Amino acid sequence: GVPTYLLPGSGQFLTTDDHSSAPVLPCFNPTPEMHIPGQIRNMLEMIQVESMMEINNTDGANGMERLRVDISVQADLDQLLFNIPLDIQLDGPLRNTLVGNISRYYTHWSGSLEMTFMFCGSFMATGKLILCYTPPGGSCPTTRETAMLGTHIVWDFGLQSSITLIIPWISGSHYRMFNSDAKSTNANVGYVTCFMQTNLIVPSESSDTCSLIGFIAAKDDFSLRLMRDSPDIGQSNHLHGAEAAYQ
Amino acid sequence: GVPTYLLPGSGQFLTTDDHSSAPVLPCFNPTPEMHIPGQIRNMLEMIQVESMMEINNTDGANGMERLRVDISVQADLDQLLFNIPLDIQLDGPLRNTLVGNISRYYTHWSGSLEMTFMFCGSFMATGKLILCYTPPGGSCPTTRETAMLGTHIVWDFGLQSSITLIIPWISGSHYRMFNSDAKSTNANVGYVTCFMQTNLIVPSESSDTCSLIGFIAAKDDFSLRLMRDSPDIGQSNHLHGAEAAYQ
Amino acid sequence: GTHIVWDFGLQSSITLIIPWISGSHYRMFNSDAKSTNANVGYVTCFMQT
Amino acid sequence: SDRVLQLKLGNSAIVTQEAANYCCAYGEWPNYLPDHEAVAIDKPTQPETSTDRFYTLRSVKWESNSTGWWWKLPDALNNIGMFGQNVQYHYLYRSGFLIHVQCNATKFHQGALLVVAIPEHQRGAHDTTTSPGFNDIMKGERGGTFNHPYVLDDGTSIACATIFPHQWINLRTNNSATIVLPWMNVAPMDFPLRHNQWTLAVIPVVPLGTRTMSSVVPITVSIAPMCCEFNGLRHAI
Amino acid sequence: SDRVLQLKLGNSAIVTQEAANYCCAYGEWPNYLPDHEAVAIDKPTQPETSTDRFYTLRSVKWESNSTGWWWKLPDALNNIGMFGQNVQYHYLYRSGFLIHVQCNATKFHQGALLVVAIPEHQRGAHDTTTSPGFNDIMKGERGGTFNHPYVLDDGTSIACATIFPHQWINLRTNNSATIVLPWMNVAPMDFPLRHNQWTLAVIPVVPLGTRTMSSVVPITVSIAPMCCEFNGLRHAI
Amino acid sequence: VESIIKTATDTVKSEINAELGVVPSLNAVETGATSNTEPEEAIQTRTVINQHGVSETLVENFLGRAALVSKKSFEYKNHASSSTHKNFFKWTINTKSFVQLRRKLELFTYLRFDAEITILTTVAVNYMGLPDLTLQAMFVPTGALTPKEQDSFHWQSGSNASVFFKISDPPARMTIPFMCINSAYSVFYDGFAGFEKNGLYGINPADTIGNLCVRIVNEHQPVGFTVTVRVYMKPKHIKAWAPRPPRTMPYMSIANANYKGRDTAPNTLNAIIGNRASVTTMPHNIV
Amino acid sequence: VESIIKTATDTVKSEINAELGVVPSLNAVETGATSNTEPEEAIQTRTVINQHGVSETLVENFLGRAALVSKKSFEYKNHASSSTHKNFFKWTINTKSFVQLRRKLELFTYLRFDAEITILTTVAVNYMGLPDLTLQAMFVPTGALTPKEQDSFHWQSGSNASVFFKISDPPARMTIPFMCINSAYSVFYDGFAGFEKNGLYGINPADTIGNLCVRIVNEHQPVGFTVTVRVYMKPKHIKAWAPRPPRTMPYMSIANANYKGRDTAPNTLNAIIGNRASVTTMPHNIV
Amino acid sequence: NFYKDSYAASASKQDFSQDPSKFTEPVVEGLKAGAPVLK
Amino acid sequence: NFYKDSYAASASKQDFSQDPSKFTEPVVEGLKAGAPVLK
Ligand SMILES: CC(=O)N[C@@H]1[C@@H](O)[C@H](O[C@@H]2O[C@H](CO)[C@H](O)[C@H](O[C@]3(C(=O)O)C[C@H](O)[C@@H](NC(C)=O)[C@H]([C@H](O)[C@H](O)CO)O3)[C@H]2O)[C@@H](CO)O[C@H]1O
Ligand SMILES: CC(=O)N[C@@H]1[C@@H](O)[C@H](O[C@@H]2O[C@H](CO)[C@H](O)[C@H](O[C@]3(C(=O)O)C[C@H](O)[C@@H](NC(C)=O)[C@H]([C@H](O)[C@H](O)CO)O3)[C@H]2O)[C@@H](CO)O[C@H]1O
């Protein structure tokens, strides 16, 4: 016969191994394939679709109220309207999004993100806002004069209802990672803030409080690595009916 | 030597495995093959032969009486004569047939079935019957006006003694399956009913009650998958003489 | 039946075509509005929204 | 055209004017043993016409309560004519069979007989663990009767018996059934007195019935061995 | 140019002067079942214009506290016109759908509706282990209402519902949404009375609001089956 | 007539028919031929390119499964005062003791195949551990000389094939070739295997593979154990002839086809199929 | 539109823009299309040759992991006076009992795949050693006939596939093919699997691989043991269609998508994301 | 097959030949489609 | 793969084909870069 010897690792069961194994039903003929709409081959395809950010994640905001940010006609100038923490690997407005959920099945990420906001006030309502992305290093800006120094887009409300703020991949390292420390130099992405560029202005019969819906998605220069169990789901008991599967 | 490692599955005995194994008698010369009539290579060949359906499976009908359906000269019009449940995977008139028995060694099936009825009355007896196949969805039809709306064949008794009702494969899914629930959407085939189209008419000296023998078989567009132990045979004790094989 | 859903906007008008749908080549007048060779059918208008 | 037929072998011939085509078991036809399948090395005797001819057995009466009849081959013919003599004087035999079952009645009679040729029809006994005895199996020319035709007296079923070479005699349609049987065995030849290759079964699935003049309705069986060969000559057993 | 649109099928037509392009689910377009994907062998009926046309359902009122509405297909149309008749008389059906949701208001009104077509939208029940019942699911032409739109009544989320074919009706921008749906299933055809391929959901993510004259603001749904095919003809259920 | 079939046949679209002298739906069961009416002739069909495979029903696969054919448990101990399998047993090989395998083989009249034999051993203390015993399975031809004791010199197996295996090893396995003196095994045998008249009916000795003699090689331990040996057989390189009506009545003996039927339907002597109220009563009717 | 992507896309340098009629940063979410604004159009970029791979997110890899789908422990002993899994159990296969695997599969509407099954067995004395038992796992089709006793003759497994393995061997393993009667499994099913109205909602039987019957082959020992069998499933040769919103509320049952939410955020019915003081409060702000 | 005896080889699941007619139509005269079987 | 059934083979991690547009831009009329989406 052939002289052989077993190596360390022999007999182990690695859940990520990749080998062929004995067919349970020999000569089985699987059902013919049929074209079905919406085939997905790489999860990166899924995260490129923008989904709603839960920006209004505050006590008092229930359900869908958490998915929209209300802006009102201001009495003062250059007013700060809201900010958004950016770690798509930690809990916050970005966690329950397509890009956030899928990314949390991984540990490393790289690539540009895009935030699109749709103004949902009445047609007669006008306004200009400034959306700013501040690369990491310091404290989140609280004044427009400071935020304005970072990456930004000035948005004019009009027929085209939505604006896109690109959060370009700006990192020293090829990838950023999750390690449960939001202030780590390899995790913190920086901040996104929104201020009135001018003001929300509406006539008497239009609502003077309008909502914005913010969306986020990854661009095609995105990459995810090192798969891990998602922290967004868990169980401490058997699900109802699980034990009945044995009866 | 050759460095190797054992994979999960090593050492197991899978009853459906397929490997070569040590010849017990080396240099043994098997008896030369001889041509023998009736060789069968695929079980599908066997189920294409029609066999008798036990349509009269009722209390009071004993033995062969269960294999024939008696029809009599009617006094009323459009009379319902009999119906037949169609799950070739459950107990009923179709279970103890060639197609039924072999199919029950499998779990999935697809293909057209054919039911042939032979009229066995006297030569002087005449009549017309309508055989209907009703695809699933509702309750079994009880009137000819309803049954007639489905797939059917009007049969005129004559020199050619038999008629064939084709039960075409009409299913949403590629295959139907057994799961012990006769009302499951992936199991129920529908119904077959038989009514007088006109009436059985015979002269004074001919018997006024005649029998039909129903047969069923699969067509060559049939397919069976997922082999399983047949529910039609079982044992709770050692057969007589089994233990004597050890003495 | 045959219909058109009309959305008010810059183009101020909508057209509903009443296609010639008749068994006979021509329809005729005979002072009987319910005659099979005269009745054309009906036109109705409802709020879509 | 396929309703009339004449069968002629040796000095015997049979005609029917109400046939239903005819069956060639498994699509085969009888033939002599070829050199490349032969085992016994002595030169065989091929009597031809003295054995390959129709032998008509005693008839049986089809009654309203009949359960069916059977005849095993070659047993049923082992003591008839020159076929029987060759069988008794030789240790080995081989042959096919041409079977013709006959039953006529009236345009006012009804009934249907399943006429099937069963290979290796090993009988079972009812409600006992004791295997059938020699006399339960070897009936000779008289043939036997079915105790439980519903299960072919072997615990299976007549419903699926159509898997075997067969025809039917449905009185309103035909008055005869014809089946051609080739040699059927795992060996090229066999000892005729202890093993039966085929069993002819005639079973009334639909009972005989009528309201006209009652008459005795017989069922008759005629069997012609085909391509007979015998080896191992000695004295008669 | 991409703000005006006319849809015409059969004897029905619809125009909008405030559209937002239109969605072709997964970039596909409806089509008839090809021979190489077919299963049911009976010749299908393709009624064309009698079934492939716009059916307008009863409207619903958009209120300040509305949670959203849903209509399952083909259930919502299983009892409407000739589409409904074919569905009732045939065991199998297959078709795509052209969906047009309508809602107009005023230049002084604000509000945003997510109009999404969800494939296999299996509903969940709230705070109980008991699965939803037949009447909780099959609402027909009337459609149903969302109990917890925030989680799409299935424990997931509306935030990520944009992964499904959709459009929005943002009052300051457009007054209609259009989605073309191809056959979506794991089988080439299906039994229309027990399985719904798609669920049309209309949910107000941004509530209706204004300070001008209060008026009833309806939401209307018009649906046109496309490339309808039916197999397994019998009586009506 | 013979051809290569790898998938179920396709369906061709068909049109309306109204031809005199042409009646495809009529047949004559009396001929013995099965109806040749095609779906295309019975109804209007569409075209269907059928890709359904037919390989799972190949005879090789249908019968190609390792099925239990023998199960024997005995006591492994000091049999000083035993009346009983004393640390070994002999089994006359047969495929008629376990019904699932028996019924499948009996769907055919003749069968030619090689037999892969797998032997599985299990032990239980009659607690302080399970011994890794060595067993010997010796193949002794039908009717041949078998050992009478665990330590008989017969086990020297000079010519008989013997396989030695440990309970800790995977089940033992080997292939017995198609060894019949004929071109195929007779699943059924309508005859007597002897020249006299008192022989056994339906038993052709030519179809008995042989004897399997199994012993524990180790001498007995201070305590007793129950050892169970299970033998599985998987036929391969199969050729089959003349299919038969499936068994319906429960089996009664391994030596014959005797029948009795269950006490009540289904599968009772006077009623194979369970009863329904009448021929117009639809069981499982959709309400 | 379809193309082969092996790495993340490169970035091209961009210059200053001041063109009338060109507004790449403006979009119309109402169309249903995701923003197509490119980084090069939003800011001035440099050229970057991106070599980052995208293979770890391939669906085959994302779902290609052996995940726990069943865990069952029972008592192996003399069950003379047991009310209880008597040395064997039956499990109706399903992928809805363990949440990590369930949530991932539910990210898709339809899935087509072959399933590699791995079975791991563990034992504990109820001390004097751990027995090297032999187990039998028999695959019994959905709704089919399962054994009622450890020694039932049903275990003869004439046609059902059975795998015999020892606790001392590596975990048993075999592949169940994509066996659905349809072209793909339905991860979600908006319908009723029966022709009547009382059937179960959301459960298409066509998506139930089948029953797994596991028994200890050895007869009981003089003492009792606790035996735990864990089954893992790894899908391969995967095709996936129509991605879906990820599950947020804790699962309640394996039979449906019923929800309740946690008692307090995160993942509570009225608040999926944890709260922050206000929309201008920056959590983890760098001090 | 590394064994010297061919009967030791693994299964042979490649025989797709069939001839159902030996069981379904063992009649001497072939039956034509559509034509009356009895004439 | 030494097994006879192809479904027994190891994983197939070589399908790098993608078409995000079926999810990201399922609009009938393609949107041009820079041009106002609504016109
Ligand atoms: C109560 C009623 O309305 N009608 C009964 C009718 O249900 C009964 O039929 C029997 O019902 C059982 C279900 O309880 C099975 O379906 C029986 O069928 C089979 C089976 O498919 O499982 C057929 C099979 O051949 C049988 N096997 C053997 C080895 O004998 C098995 C077997 O007996 C069972 O599994 C027992 O465990 O049954 C079916 O006949 C009829 C009886 O006359 O009576 C009605 O009243
Ligand atoms: C105290 C304070 O200043 N602010 C709290 C804020 O921290 C709290 O947020 C929660 O904080 C925890 C850290 O303690 C987690 O980050 C929670 O997030 C996740 C996680 O990422 O781990 C999200 C995930 O989806 C959750 N999973 C499941 C299966 O439910 C987990 C999970 O609950 C934890 O891991 C529990 O073990 O949490 C994050 O929300 C909010 C709550 O309103 O309140 C502030 O006051």
Curated annotation (Swiss-Prot), chains D, E:
It is found in: Virion; Host cytoplasm. Forms an icosahedral capsid of pseudo T=3 symmetry with capsid proteins VP2 and VP3. The capsid is 300 Angstroms in diameter, composed of 60 copies of each capsid protein and enclosing the viral positive strand RNA genome. Interacts with capsid protein VP1 and capsid protein VP3 in the mature capsid. This is Capsid protein VP2. It comes from Human enterovirus D68 (EV68). The chain holds residues 79 to 315 of 2188 of the full protein.
From Swiss-Prot, chains F, G:
It is found in: Virion; Host cytoplasm. N-acetylneuraminate binds at residues 262, 266-267. Disulfide bonds: none annotated. Interacts with capsid protein VP0, and capsid protein VP3 to form heterotrimeric protomers. Five protomers subsequently associate to form pentamers which serve as building blocks for the capsid. Interacts with capsid protein VP2, capsid protein VP3 and capsid protein VP4 following cleavage of capsid protein VP0. Forms an icosahedral capsid of pseudo T=3 symmetry with capsid proteins VP2 and VP3. The capsid is 300 Angstroms in diameter, composed of 60 copies of each capsid protein and enclosing the viral positive strand RNA genome. Capsid protein VP1 mainly forms the vertices of the capsid. Capsid protein VP1, together with VP3, interacts with host cell sialic acids to provide virion attachment to target host cells. This attachment induces virion internalization. After binding to its receptor, the capsid undergoes conformational changes. This is Capsid protein VP1. It comes from Human enterovirus D68 (EV68). The lineage of its organism: Viruses, Riboviria, Orthornavirae, Pisuviricota, Pisoniviricetes.
